[PDB]
Coordinates of N, CA and C and ligand atoms in Angstrom, one line a residue:
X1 N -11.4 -6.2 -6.8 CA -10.4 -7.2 -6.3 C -9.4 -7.6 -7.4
X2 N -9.7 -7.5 -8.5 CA -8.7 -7.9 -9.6 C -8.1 -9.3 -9.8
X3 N -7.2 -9.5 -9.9 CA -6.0 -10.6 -10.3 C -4.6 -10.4 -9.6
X4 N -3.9 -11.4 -8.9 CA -3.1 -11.5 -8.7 C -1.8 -11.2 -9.5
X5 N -0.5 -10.7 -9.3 CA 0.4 -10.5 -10.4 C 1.3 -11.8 -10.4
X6 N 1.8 -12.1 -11.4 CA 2.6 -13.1 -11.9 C 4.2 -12.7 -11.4
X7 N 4.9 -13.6 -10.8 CA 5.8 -13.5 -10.0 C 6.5 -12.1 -10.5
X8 N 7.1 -11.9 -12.1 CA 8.0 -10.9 -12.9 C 7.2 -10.0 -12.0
X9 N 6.5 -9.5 -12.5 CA 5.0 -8.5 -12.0 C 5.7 -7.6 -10.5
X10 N 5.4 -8.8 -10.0 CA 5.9 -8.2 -8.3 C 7.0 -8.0 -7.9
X11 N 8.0 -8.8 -8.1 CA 9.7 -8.8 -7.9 C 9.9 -7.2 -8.4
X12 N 9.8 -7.2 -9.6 CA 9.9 -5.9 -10.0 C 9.5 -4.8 -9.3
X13 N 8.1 -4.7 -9.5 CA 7.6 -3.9 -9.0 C 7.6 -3.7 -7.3
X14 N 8.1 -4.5 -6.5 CA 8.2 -4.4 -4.9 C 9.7 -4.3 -4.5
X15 N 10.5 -4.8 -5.2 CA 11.9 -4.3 -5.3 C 12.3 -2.9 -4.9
X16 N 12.6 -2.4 -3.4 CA 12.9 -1.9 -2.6 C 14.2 -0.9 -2.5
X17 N 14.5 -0.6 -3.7 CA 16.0 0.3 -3.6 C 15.2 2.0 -3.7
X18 N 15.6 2.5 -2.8 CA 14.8 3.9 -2.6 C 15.1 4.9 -4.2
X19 N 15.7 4.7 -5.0 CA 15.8 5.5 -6.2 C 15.5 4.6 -7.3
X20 N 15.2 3.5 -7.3 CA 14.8 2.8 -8.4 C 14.3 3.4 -9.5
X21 N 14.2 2.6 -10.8 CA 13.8 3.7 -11.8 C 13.5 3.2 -13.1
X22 N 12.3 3.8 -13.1 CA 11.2 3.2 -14.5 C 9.8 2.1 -14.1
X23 N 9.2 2.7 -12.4 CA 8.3 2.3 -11.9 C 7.8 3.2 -12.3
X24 N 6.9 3.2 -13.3 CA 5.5 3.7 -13.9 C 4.3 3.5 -13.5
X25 N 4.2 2.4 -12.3 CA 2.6 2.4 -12.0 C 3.2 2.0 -10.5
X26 N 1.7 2.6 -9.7 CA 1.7 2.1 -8.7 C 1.0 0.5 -8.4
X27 N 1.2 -0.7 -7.9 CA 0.4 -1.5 -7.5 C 0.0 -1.8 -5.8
X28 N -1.2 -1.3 -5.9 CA -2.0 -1.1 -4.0 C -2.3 -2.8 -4.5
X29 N -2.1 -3.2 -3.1 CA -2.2 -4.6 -2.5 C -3.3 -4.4 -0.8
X30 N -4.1 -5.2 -0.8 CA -4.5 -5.0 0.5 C -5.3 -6.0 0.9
X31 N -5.5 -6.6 2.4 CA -6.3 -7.4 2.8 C -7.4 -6.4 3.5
X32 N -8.8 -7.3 3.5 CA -9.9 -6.5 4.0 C -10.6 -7.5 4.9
X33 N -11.0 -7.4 6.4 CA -11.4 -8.4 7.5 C -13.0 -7.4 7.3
X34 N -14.0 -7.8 6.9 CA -15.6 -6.7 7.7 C -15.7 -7.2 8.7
X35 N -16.2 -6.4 9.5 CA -16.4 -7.0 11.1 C -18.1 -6.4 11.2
X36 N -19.1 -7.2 11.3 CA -20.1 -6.2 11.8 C -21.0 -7.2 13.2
X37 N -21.1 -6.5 14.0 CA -21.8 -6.6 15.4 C -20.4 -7.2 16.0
X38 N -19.1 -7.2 15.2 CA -17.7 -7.8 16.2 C -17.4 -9.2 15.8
X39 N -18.0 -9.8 15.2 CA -17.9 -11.0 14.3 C -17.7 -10.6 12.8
X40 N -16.1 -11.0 13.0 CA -15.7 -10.8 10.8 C -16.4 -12.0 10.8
X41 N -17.4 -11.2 9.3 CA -18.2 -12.1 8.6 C -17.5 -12.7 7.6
X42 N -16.4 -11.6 6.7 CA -16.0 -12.1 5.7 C -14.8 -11.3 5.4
X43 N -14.0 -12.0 4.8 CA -12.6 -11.6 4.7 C -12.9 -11.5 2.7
X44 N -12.2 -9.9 2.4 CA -11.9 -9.9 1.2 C -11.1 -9.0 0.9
X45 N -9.8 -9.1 -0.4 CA -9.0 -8.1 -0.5 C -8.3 -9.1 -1.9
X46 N -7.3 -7.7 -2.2 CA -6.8 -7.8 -3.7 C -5.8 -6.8 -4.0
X47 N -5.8 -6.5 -5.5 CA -4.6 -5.6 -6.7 C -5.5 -4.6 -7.3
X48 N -5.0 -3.4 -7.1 CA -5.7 -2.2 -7.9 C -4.2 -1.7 -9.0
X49 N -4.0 -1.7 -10.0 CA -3.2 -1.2 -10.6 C -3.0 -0.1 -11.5
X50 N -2.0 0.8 -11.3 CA -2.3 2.2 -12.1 C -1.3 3.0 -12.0
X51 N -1.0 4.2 -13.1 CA 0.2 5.2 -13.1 C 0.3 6.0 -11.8
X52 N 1.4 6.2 -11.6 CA 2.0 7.3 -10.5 C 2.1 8.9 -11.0
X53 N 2.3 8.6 -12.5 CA 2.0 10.1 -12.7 C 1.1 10.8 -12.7
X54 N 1.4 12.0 -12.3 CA 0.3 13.2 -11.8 C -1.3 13.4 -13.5
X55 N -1.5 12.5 -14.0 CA -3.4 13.1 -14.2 C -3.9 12.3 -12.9
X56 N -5.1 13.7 -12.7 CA -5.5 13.4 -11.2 C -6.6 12.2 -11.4
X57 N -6.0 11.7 -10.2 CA -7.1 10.4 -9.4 C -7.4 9.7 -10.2
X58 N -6.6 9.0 -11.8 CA -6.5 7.5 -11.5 C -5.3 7.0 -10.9
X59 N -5.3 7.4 -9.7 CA -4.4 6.9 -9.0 C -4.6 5.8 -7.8
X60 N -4.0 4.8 -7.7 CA -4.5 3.1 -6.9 C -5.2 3.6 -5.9
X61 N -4.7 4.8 -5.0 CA -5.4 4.9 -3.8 C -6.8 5.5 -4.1
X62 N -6.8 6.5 -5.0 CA -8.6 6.5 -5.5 C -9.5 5.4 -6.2
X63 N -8.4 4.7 -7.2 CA -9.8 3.3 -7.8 C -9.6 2.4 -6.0
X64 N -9.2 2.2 -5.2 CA -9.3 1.9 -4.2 C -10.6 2.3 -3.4
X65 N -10.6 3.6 -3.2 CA -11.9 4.2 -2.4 C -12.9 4.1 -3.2
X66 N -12.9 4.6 -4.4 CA -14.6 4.2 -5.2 C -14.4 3.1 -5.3
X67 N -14.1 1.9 -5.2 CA -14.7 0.2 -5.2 C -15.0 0.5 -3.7
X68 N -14.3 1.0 -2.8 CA -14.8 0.4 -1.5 C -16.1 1.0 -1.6
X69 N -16.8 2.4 -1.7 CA -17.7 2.8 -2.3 C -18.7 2.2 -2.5
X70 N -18.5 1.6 -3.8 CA -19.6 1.1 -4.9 C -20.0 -0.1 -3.9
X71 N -19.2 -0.9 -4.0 CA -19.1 -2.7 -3.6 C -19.4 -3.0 -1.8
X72 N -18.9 -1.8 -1.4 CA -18.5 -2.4 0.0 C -19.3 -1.7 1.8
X73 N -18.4 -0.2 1.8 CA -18.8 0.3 2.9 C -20.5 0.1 3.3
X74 N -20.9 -0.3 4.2 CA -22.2 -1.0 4.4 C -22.4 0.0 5.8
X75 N -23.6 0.7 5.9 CA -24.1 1.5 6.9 C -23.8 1.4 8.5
X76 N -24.0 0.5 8.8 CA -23.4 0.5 10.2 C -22.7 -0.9 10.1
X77 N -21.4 -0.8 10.1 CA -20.2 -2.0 10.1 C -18.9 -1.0 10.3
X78 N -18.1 -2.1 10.8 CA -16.6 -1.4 11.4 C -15.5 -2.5 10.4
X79 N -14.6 -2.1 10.2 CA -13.9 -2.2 8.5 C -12.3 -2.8 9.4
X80 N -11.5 -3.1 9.1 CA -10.0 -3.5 9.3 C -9.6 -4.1 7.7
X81 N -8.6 -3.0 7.4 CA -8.1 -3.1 6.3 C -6.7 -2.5 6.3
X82 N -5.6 -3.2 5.4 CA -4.5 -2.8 5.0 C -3.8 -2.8 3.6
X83 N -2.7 -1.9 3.6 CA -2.4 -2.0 2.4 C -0.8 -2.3 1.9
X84 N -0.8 -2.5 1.0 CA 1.0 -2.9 0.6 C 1.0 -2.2 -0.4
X85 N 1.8 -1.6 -1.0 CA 1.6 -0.5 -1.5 C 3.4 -0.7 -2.4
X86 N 3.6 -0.6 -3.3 CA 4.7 -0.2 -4.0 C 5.6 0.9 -4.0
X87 N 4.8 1.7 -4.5 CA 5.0 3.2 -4.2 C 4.2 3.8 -3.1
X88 N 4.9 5.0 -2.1 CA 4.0 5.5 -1.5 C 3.4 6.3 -2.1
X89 N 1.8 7.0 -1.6 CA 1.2 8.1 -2.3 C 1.9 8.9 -3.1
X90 N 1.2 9.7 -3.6 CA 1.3 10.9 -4.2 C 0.9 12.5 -2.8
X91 N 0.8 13.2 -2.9 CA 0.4 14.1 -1.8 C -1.0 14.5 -1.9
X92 N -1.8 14.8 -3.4 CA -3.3 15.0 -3.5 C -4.0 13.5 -3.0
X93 N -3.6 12.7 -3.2 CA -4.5 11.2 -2.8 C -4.3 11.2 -1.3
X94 N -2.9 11.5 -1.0 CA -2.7 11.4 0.6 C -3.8 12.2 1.4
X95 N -4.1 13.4 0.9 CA -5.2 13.7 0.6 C -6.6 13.4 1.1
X96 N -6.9 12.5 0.3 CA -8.3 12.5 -0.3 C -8.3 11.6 0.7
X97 N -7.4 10.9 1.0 CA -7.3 9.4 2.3 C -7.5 10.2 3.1
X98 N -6.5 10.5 3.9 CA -6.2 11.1 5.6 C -8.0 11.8 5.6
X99 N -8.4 12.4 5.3 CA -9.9 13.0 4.7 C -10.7 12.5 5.0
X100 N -11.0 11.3 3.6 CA -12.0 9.9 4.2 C -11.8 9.7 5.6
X101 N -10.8 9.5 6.2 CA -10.5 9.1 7.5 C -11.0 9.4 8.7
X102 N -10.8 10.5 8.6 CA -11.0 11.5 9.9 C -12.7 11.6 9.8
X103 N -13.1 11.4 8.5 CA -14.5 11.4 8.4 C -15.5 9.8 8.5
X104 N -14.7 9.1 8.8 CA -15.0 7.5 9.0 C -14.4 6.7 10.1
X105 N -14.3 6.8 11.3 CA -13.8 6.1 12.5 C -14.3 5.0 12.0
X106 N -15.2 4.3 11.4 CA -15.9 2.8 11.3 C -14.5 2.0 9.8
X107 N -13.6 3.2 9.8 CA -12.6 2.3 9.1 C -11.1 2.9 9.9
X108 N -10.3 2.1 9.2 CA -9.3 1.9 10.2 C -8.4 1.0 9.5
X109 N -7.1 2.2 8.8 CA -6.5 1.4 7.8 C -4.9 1.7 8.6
X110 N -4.2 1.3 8.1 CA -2.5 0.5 8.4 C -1.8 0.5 7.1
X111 N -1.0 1.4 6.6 CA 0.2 1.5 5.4 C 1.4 0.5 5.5
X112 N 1.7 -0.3 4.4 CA 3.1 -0.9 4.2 C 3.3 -0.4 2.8
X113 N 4.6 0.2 2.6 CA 5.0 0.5 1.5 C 6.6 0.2 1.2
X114 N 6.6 -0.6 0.3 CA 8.0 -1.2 -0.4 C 9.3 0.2 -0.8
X115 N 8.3 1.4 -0.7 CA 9.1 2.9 -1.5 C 8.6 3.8 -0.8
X116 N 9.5 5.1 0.1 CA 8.8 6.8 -0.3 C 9.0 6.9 -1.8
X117 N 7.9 7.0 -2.2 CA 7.9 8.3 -3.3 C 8.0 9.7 -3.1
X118 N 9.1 9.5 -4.0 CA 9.8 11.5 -3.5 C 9.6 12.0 -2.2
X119 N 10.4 11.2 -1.8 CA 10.5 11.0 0.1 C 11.5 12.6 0.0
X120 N 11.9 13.3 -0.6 CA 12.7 14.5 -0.3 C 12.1 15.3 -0.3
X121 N 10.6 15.4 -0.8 CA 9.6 16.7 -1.5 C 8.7 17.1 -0.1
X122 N 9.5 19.0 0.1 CA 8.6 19.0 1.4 C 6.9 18.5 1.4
X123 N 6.4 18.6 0.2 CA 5.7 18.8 -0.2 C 4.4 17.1 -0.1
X124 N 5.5 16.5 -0.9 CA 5.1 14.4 -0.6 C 4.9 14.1 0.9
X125 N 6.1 15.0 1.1 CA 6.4 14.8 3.2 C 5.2 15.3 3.7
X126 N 4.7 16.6 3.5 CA 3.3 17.1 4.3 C 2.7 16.2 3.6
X127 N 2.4 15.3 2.9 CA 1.1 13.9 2.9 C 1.4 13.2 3.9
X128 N 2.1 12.3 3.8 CA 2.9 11.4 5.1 C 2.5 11.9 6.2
X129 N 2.6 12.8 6.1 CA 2.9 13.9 7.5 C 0.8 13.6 8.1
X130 N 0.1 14.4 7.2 CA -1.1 14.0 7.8 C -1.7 12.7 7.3
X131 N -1.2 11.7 7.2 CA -1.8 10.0 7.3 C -1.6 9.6 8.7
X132 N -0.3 9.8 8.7 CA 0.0 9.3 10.4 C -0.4 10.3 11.2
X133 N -0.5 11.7 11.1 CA -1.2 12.6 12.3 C -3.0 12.3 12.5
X134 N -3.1 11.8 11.3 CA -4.8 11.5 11.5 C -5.2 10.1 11.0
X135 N -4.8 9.6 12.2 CA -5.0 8.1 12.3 C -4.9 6.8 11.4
X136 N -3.7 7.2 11.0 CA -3.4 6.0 9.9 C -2.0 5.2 10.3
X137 N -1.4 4.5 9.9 CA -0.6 3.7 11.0 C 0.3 3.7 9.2
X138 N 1.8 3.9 9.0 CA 2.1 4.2 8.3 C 3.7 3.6 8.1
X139 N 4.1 2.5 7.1 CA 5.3 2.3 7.8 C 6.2 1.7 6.6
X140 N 7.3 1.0 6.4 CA 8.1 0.7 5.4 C 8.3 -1.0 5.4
X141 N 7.7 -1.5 4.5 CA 7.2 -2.6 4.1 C 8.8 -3.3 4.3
X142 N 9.2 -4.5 4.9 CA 10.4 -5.2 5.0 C 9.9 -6.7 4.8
X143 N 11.2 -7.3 5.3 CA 11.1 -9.0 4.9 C 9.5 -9.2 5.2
X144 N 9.3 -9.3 6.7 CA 8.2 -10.2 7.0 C 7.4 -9.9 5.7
X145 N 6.8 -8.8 5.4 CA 5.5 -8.1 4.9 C 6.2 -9.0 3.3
X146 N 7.3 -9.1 2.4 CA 7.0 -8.9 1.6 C 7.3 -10.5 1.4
X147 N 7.2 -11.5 1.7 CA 7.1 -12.7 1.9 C 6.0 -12.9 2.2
X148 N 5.5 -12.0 2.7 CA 3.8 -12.2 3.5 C 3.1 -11.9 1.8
X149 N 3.7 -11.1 1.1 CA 3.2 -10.5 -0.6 C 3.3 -11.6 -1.3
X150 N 4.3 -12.5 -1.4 CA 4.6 -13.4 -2.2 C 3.8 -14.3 -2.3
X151 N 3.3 -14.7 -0.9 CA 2.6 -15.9 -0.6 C 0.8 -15.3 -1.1
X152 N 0.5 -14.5 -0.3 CA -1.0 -14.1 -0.7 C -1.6 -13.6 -2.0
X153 N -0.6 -12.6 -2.6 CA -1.2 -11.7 -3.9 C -0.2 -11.7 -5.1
X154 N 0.3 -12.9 -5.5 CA 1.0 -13.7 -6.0 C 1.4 -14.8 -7.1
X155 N 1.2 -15.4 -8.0 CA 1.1 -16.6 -9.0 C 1.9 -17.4 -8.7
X156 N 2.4 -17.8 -8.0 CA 3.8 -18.2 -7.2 C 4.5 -19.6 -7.6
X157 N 3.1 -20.0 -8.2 CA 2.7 -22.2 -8.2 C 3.7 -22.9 -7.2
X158 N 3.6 -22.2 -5.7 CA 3.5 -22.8 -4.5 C 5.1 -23.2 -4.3
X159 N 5.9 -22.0 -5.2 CA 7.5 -21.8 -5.0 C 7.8 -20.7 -3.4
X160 N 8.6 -20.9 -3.0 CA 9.0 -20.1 -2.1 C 9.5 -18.4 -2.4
X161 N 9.3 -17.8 -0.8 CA 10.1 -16.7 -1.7 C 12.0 -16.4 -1.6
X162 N 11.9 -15.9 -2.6 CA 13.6 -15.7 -2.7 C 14.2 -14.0 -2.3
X163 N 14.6 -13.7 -1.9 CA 14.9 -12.2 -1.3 C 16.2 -11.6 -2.0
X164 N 15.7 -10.4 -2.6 CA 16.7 -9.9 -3.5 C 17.6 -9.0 -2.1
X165 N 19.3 -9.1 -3.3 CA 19.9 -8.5 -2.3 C 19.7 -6.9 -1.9
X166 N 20.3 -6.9 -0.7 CA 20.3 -5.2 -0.2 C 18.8 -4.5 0.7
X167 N 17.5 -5.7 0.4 CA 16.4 -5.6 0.5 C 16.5 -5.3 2.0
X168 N 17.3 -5.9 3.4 CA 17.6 -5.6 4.8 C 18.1 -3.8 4.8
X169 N 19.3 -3.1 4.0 CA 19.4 -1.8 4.0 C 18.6 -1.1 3.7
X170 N 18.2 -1.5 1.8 CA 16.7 -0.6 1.6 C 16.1 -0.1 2.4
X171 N 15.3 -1.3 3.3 CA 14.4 -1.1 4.4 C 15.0 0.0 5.6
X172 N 16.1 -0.4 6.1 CA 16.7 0.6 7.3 C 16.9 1.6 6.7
X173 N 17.6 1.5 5.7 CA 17.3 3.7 5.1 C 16.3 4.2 5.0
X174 N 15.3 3.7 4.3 CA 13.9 4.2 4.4 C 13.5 4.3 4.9
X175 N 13.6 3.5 6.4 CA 12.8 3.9 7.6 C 13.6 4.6 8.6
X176 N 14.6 5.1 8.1 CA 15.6 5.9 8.8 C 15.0 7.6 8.5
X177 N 14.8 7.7 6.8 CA 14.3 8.5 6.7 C 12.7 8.7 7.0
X178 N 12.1 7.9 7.4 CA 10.5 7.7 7.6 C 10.3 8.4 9.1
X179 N 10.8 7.8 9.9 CA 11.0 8.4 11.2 C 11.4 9.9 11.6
X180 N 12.3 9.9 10.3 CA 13.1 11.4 9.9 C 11.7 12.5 10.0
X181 N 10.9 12.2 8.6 CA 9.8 12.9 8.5 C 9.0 13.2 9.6
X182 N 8.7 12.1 10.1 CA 7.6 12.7 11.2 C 8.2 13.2 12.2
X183 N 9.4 12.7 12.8 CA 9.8 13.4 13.5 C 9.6 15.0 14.3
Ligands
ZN1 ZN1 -1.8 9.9 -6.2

């Protein structure tokens, strides 16, 4: 679960201009509801933080799956989880996800991401491409979501949030191109 980031932390790093530049790490954000016999017992979720560059799998979406691993997936229970995501995948983790997936109906996850990473690379695109083909709900993080960031995973000392400009386009291009992809 980690620590929350301190306002600098997130502004920065969720700041939304599709070429931005000198994001060195990814930060996965995500809420976790267990549900087991259909009654969430317990609600938990958090900050995994880590580089985007290619050495394999320390990458957020793998320390992601090994804590859920170690800490969490419990034998017969049904999972609802999501993520906020800074950057989108990489294409080997997209990977290793869509994967887990198709091999675990008892989870059931939902993408918000502030960025395509290398949204141009046929290559980034075939990941994208099998998250949403194999049951993953996959989509471009805007106002609501990232107001919804400020307030939950946050240091905020109970300030509001303030919305950088351009953050309304960002979003419609990205998801102009998001739609593009799957298409
Ligand atoms: Zn990766």
């Amino acid at each position: 679960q980690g620590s929350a980031m301190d306002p600098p932390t997130f502004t920065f790093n969720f700041n939304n201009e599709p070429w931005v530049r000198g994001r060195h790490e990814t930060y996965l954000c995500f809420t976790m509801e267990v549900v087991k016999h259909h009654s969430p017992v317990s609600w938990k979720r958090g900050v995994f933080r880590n580089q985007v560059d290619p050495e394999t799998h320390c990458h957020a979406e793998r320390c992601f799956l090994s804590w859920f691993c170690d800490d969490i997936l419990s034998p017969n229970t049904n999972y609802e989880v999501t993520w906020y995501t800074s950057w989108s995948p990489c294409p080997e983790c997209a990977g290793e996800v869509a994967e887990f997936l198709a091999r675990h109906s008892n989870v059931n996850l939902t993408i918000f991401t502030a960025r395509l990473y290398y949204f141009w690379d046929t290559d980034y695109q075939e990941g994208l491409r099998s998250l949403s083909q194999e049951g993953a709900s996959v989509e471009i993080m805007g106002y609501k979501d990232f107001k919804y960031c400020w307030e939950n995973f946050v240091y905020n000392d109970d300030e509001p949030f303030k919305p950088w400009k351009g953050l309304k386009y960002n979003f419609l291009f990205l998801d102009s191109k998001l739609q593009e992809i799957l298409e």
